[PDB]
Amino acid sequence: SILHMPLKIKDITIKNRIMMSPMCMYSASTDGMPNDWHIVHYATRAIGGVGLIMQEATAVESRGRITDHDLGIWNDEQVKELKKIVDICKANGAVMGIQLAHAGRKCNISYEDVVGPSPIKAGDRYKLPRELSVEEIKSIVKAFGEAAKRANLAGYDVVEIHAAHGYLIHEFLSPLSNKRKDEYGNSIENRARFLIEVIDEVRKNWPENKPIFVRVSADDYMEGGINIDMMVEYINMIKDKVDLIDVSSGGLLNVDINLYPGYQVKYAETIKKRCNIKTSAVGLITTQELAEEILSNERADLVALGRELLRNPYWVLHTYTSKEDWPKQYERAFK
Amino acid sequence: SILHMPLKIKDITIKNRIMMSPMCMYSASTDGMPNDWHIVHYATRAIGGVGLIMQEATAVESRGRITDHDLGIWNDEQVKELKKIVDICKANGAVMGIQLAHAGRKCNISYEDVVGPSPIKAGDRYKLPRELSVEEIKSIVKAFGEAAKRANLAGYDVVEIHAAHGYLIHEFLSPLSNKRKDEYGNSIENRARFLIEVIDEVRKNWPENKPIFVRVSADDYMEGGINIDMMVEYINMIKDKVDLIDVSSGGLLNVDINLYPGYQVKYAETIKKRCNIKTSAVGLITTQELAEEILSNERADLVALGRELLRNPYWVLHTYTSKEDWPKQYERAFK
Amino acid sequence: SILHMPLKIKDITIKNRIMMSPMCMYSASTDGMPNDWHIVHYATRAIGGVGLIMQEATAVESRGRITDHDLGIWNDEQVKELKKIVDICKANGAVMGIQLAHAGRKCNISYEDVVGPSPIKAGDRYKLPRELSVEEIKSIVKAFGEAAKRANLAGYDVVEIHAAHGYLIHEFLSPLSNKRKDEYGNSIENRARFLIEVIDEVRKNWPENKPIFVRVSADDYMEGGINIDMMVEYINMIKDKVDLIDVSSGGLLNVDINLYPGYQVKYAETIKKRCNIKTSAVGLITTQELAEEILSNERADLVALGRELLRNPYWVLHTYTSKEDWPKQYERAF
Amino acid sequence: SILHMPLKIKDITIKNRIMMSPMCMYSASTDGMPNDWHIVHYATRAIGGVGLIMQEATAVESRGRITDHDLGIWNDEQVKELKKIVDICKANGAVMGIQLAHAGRKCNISYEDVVGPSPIKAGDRYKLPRELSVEEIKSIVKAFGEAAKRANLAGYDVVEIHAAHGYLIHEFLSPLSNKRKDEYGNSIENRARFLIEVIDEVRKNWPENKPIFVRVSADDYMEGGINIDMMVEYINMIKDKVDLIDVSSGGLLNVDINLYPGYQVKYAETIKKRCNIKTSAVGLITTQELAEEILSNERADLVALGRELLRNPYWVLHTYTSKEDWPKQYERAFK
C-alpha cells in the first residue's frame, strides 16, 4: 500500500504515512505530569504500527493549558516524565512528536492567568482574557523556545506548533479575535508576527536536522475571519522555516459546519499545491480506502487519524499483508 | 447520506447518486440478444437500490461488438428483448441507461469487419483494422442515430455514448491511433469531428427531455496521446450538447498504470470544474466513506460502482438508515 | 470450509450446506401465481451460491393460504408458472425445494373457509376455525398428495411438508390446539395421525429417489404444549419415511421467547442425535463462523439462513476462497 | 448482550463474560522477569474492557518453564514486578488472574532439568524426561503452593492451575504418558493424585474467598488417552475444591486435529452439564455472534478469546451500545 511508503523529513524517517492526530486525554495531574495512563495509551498505538505518534497538546506555560488535567512542558521536572512516553514509543517502532500548545483565551481553567491578543471571551463560560503587552508576547515566544529545548532533551523527533483550534496563535491570526492596533495587529503581516516569532524561537532551540510541523485552522467558517486564501498567504510567509503543515479548521468561535469524511482534505490539498509544502490531512477519515486515495492522489503527504485510533488502535497492523510485519508476539494472530 | 440526494437531469430524476457502471457480461448469444441472465443481473441491482443502472456496452453495429456474446441494438428485432431489461429495472425503482458502443479496432470477433480511423493494431494480439472511408464514417454515425431511436423505443431513460476505453470514438480522438490526413484527422477539431457528428445524430433521434451522457478516457498515459488538457478541450466542444461526462481513462494501448482507490477521481473533478459540466467518478471505489467524500467535496455529481456491485449487489440498501427505505418484501431484514 | 462439503440425500446432491429458509414474499396475486418478482428473488440467491433454495410456503388448497398474496399449488395451471422459478434456479446451480403448506386456523383471508382440528382461535385477530370432519381431513391429505404430484411435474428436487409455525399440521400435533376425541386426537399416536397420513400420501405422489423434508416446531414454549421430548417421539414415528427434519419452534400461540443467535440449534441437535436423522438448523444465524461451528460440531447437517439472505443475497459467494467458485460473469470481482 | 452480564465467583465479581485466554508472549528475561512489554500488553486489554485477564503460563520453578523467555513466580523479585501488571489491569477495571504452570516433559530449554511422570518423550524434537521420585513430586506440589502464596502477595484475584496442553499435570493424567506403577499411576484415582495434591496445596496458600480455576485438556484425540468421559471423572474428583474449569484439549502428543470455530465447545458444555460446575469455552471463537450463542445456549459460563484479543484488543468495547460504557478518555470515539 502507498500508506506503507516511508517519508523522510530532514534526518527523521517516518516508516509509513499514518500519524496519530494529537488528542487531549485530560488525564494528567494539576502539575501537568503524565502517568502510566499516558504511557500505555501512546505505547498501544506504537505497538499498533503508527508511523508518527503526535502527543496531545502539551502546554508551554501553565496558563496555556486547556484544562488543569493537561500535559505540560513548562518546567524542567516534566522532561524526565515525558521521556518515559518517548522511550517506550520509539522502542516499539514509532517516530515521536510533541504538539507544543498555548490555549490563550480558550484556557478553561477559571483560576488561571488567562491571556489573549484582545480582551474578548472565547464564549460566555470563559474568563475574560488579559490583553497581552508586547513584552508579555516576547516572554511567551521565549516559553515556546524553552519548551522546544525541553522536548529535545526528552528525545522527541518532531515538534509541532499548535496554531489552530481557537488557541493563542490562531487568536492572533484571525481578524475576528485580533483587534490590536500595534505591531501584532491590523495588517496580515502583523497578525502573522507572533506565529513567525514562535517558529524562529523554536528553531533556535531545536536541532536543525529535526523537523518542525505547524498545525493550522484553514477556515473560521465566518465572514471576516480566516479562509483558505488567507491561510495560503500565511503559509507562504513561513514555508522556508517549517517542514509540514498539519491542516485542520475551526475552533475560534462556535459555528455549525457540514461534517463528512474528508471534510478538511481540500484545505490540505490546496495548501500543498499553492504553497508547495508537505501537508497532513485529518478529519473523519476512518477507512484504508480513503487514506490510500488521499495519499495516492497527492492530496496530502501524511494521513492523520484521531478518533479511529481511539476505537481501533491497531488500524495500521490490519493493513499489513504478511505476518512478518506484525509484532513477533502477535504473529500467530495474523489472518 | 449525501448519496441519497436526488439528481434531476432534463426530465429524468435519479433518486440517489449511485450509478451501476456499464460492465460487459459476455452472456448474450451471437444474435446480440439479451436473455434471462441479463434480466436477473440488472433487476438485482434495481432491487438493491441503485439510482441509475447503466447497461453494458451495447453494439450499434454487429462489427462494433467487442465479442459475439455482447448485447446489440443494431436491429429492430433486438428492441423487444432489451425492453424486458428496461421494464423490470424501472418497475423496481431504477433509472435505466444504455451504453451505445462501437469497439472499432478492439473488436475481437474473427469473422467480423474490424474497422478503425487508421490501420494500426490496438496491440500485438489484435487484428489490423480496416481504415474507414468518409462514406463509411457517415454510415456509422447513422448507426449511432438508429441505435438511439431504438433505445427510445425500448424505453431507456438515458443514453450514453461510449467514447472511452480504446474503442472506436476514442481511436478517432487520440493522436496515437488517429493518423488520418483528411477532415477526421491532423487537428484537434478534426479528431473531435466523429464524436461531434455522433452526438448530433443521436440528438436527432433522442427526445430533447432525456439526458445524453458521454464516457471518455481522460488520459492515455502516453506521451503524444490524450491528457487532461486535451480532454478539457474536447469536452468544451460538446458541453452545450450533452448533460454529463462519465469520466474514465486508458484502454487505447497497453500501459502500466498506478491503480488505487479513486485513481480516476481527479479527472472527474478537473473536468467538472474546468468545463462547468456534471461528471461521474469511477474506478476502485468500494466504500460508502469514499463515495460520500467524493460527493461532499464536489468532485463529481454521481459515483459509479462497477466491481463492488458485482460482488455486493445490495450496497445501496446497506446505506439506508430506515426499514421503510427497503423493498417491502425485505423490510424484516433491516438492521 | 465444511460449509462447502456436498450433502447427498437419496439421488439429490446439494453442493454445499446452506439452505435458503422458506420465507413468504406476499407478492403473488389472488390466483396464487408467481410473477417476475419471485423469479428474480429466488434466482438471485441461486447466483449467490445457495446450495438448496427452499421456496416459501406454497398453499395446497386456497383455504390453506396465509394471505391472498401467497403462492399456490392447488391447481394444474400453477405448475407451468412455478416451473419458471425451478428452471432458472437449477440453471444457476441450486437444488430447488418447495414448502408445501396449509395455514389452517392461521389463514388470514377474511373470505376463506378457515379450518382446524378444533374450533379454537390462534389469537384475538384470527377467525374461529371450522372443525374438520374425518372426510375433510382425508380430502386435505389428498390435496397434499396432488400438490406433491404437481411439484414433481414442475421439476422441484425436494419437497418439504410444513408441519410448523402454528399452521394446520402443527395444530393437530399440539395438545393446546387439538382437543379432538376421535382418531385424530387424545393420544400422541392420534395427534400424529394427520402428519403421518400426509407423509404417506406425499410418498405416493413423489419419486422415491427424491428427498422429503419436514419442518417442525419443536417447542410451543407453553405448559401442555409441544416440547423437545414430545417432538422426538413424533420424529421417531416418521423417520423411516422422510429424509431430514427442518427444525424450528413456536407459532401456535403468542409467547414470549428469548431470542439470540442459534436459539433453535439445541432442538436441531437433540433431534439429530436422539432420532439418528439428518436435521437443518435455523434462527438468527448470520455469520460464517456460527454456521461452521454448527456443522462441524454435528449439531445439524444443513444451516438455513432466512433474513441474512434477504439483506445479503451473495453470502455464500463471500465464503469462497477462489474466483473459480464464482459465477464466471463476476469472477473479476473476486 | 448476555456477554455483558457479571459473574460473581466467591468474593470476586467479573464485570462481563469475556476472559483473555492465557497466551505466552516469550518476552521475559532468562530470570523470568516481566518488563514494560508485558505491562502494556495486559493493560491494553484491560482498557479494552476485558472482564478477566488471565496472565500467560507463569512457571512455578525454572525447569517448569516452556522457554527461557517465560514469566516465572518462583521468587520474590518476580512478585515485585508482576504486581505492576496486576495493579494497572485492576486500575483499569479488569479482574486479574494468573496461570500457574509447569511444562514437565515439554520444557523446551536445552540446559534445564526436564522432568515427567514417566521416561517418554513428547515428540522427537523433545528431551527424554527423567522420572520423578515421589519425594520430588512432593517438592513440586510444594512449589505450586509457594507460587500461589506469591500470587496472592502480588494481588492476583484468580489463580488458575494449568493442567492442560501436554504439560506436567496433564502428563500424569493421561494413560499415554503416565506408565507409573506406584501410587501416582495405573488406576484413575492414582493418575489424578498429583492434580488433587496440587489443588490441595494451592488451597492452603490461597485465600478461601478468591476463585481457583483449572485448565484441562478434555481429549488427547488418541485411543487409550484422555477423552471427555475420563475428564468428567477427573472433574468429579475436584469440583468441590475449585470454582471453574477452563476447558481446552490436546497438547500431549502431536495429533492431526480438525480445527474450526468452537471445536472445543462441546467439551465445555459436557463438563458443565455432567459435573454441575462452571466452565469457560475457548478455541477459534472470534465473533460476538458465536460468543452470545455459547453463553445463551448454556454451553459455558465464560467465553475465552486468545488470538482475537491479540489482533483486536478492544473487541469488548466494540460490543457496547452506549458511549458511557467506554473509557471516559475514548468516549468521543463511540460510533
Ligand SMILES: Cc1cc2nc3c(=O)[nH]c(=O)nc-3n(C[C@H](O)[C@H](O)[C@H](O)COP(=O)(O)O)c2cc1C
Ligand atoms: C479527545 C480529543 C482530543 C483532541 N485534542 C486535540 C489536541 O490536543 N490537539 C489537536 O490539535 N487536536 C485535538 N483534537 C482534534 C483531533 O486531533 C482531530 O484533529 C479531530 O478529531 C479530527 O480527526 P478525527 O475525525 O480523525 O478524530 C482532539 C480530538 C478529540 C476527539
Ligand SMILES: Cc1cc2nc3c(=O)[nH]c(=O)nc-3n(C[C@H](O)[C@H](O)[C@H](O)COP(=O)(O)O)c2cc1C
Ligand atoms: C466485467 C467488466 C466489464 C466491463 N465492461 C464495461 C463496459 O461495457 N463499458 C464500460 O464503459 N466499462 C466497462 N468496464 C469498466 C467498468 O465499467 C468500470 O469503469 C471499471 O471496472 C472501474 O470501476 P470499478 O473499479 O468500480 O469496477 C467493465 C469492467 C468489468 C470488470
Ligand SMILES: Cc1cc2nc3c(=O)[nH]c(=O)nc-3n(C[C@H](O)[C@H](O)[C@H](O)COP(=O)(O)O)c2cc1C
Ligand atoms: C418474510 C418472512 C417470511 C417467512 N415465511 C416463512 C415461510 O413461508 N415458511 C417458513 O417455514 N418460515 C417462514 N418464515 C420463517 C423463516 O423461514 C425462518 O425460519 C426465520 O426467519 C428464522 O430464521 P432467520 O433468523 O435466519 O431469518 C418467514 C420469515 C420471514 C422473515
Ligand SMILES: Cc1cc2nc3c(=O)[nH]c(=O)nc-3n(C[C@H](O)[C@H](O)[C@H](O)COP(=O)(O)O)c2cc1C
Ligand atoms: C501465542 C500463544 C500463546 C499461548 N500460550 C498459552 C498459555 O500460556 N497457556 C494456555 O493455557 N494456552 C496458551 N495458548 C493457547 C490459548 O490460550 C488458547 O487456548 C488457544 O489459542 C485457542 O484460543 P484462540 O483460538 O482464541 O486463540 C497460547 C496460544 C497462543 C496463540
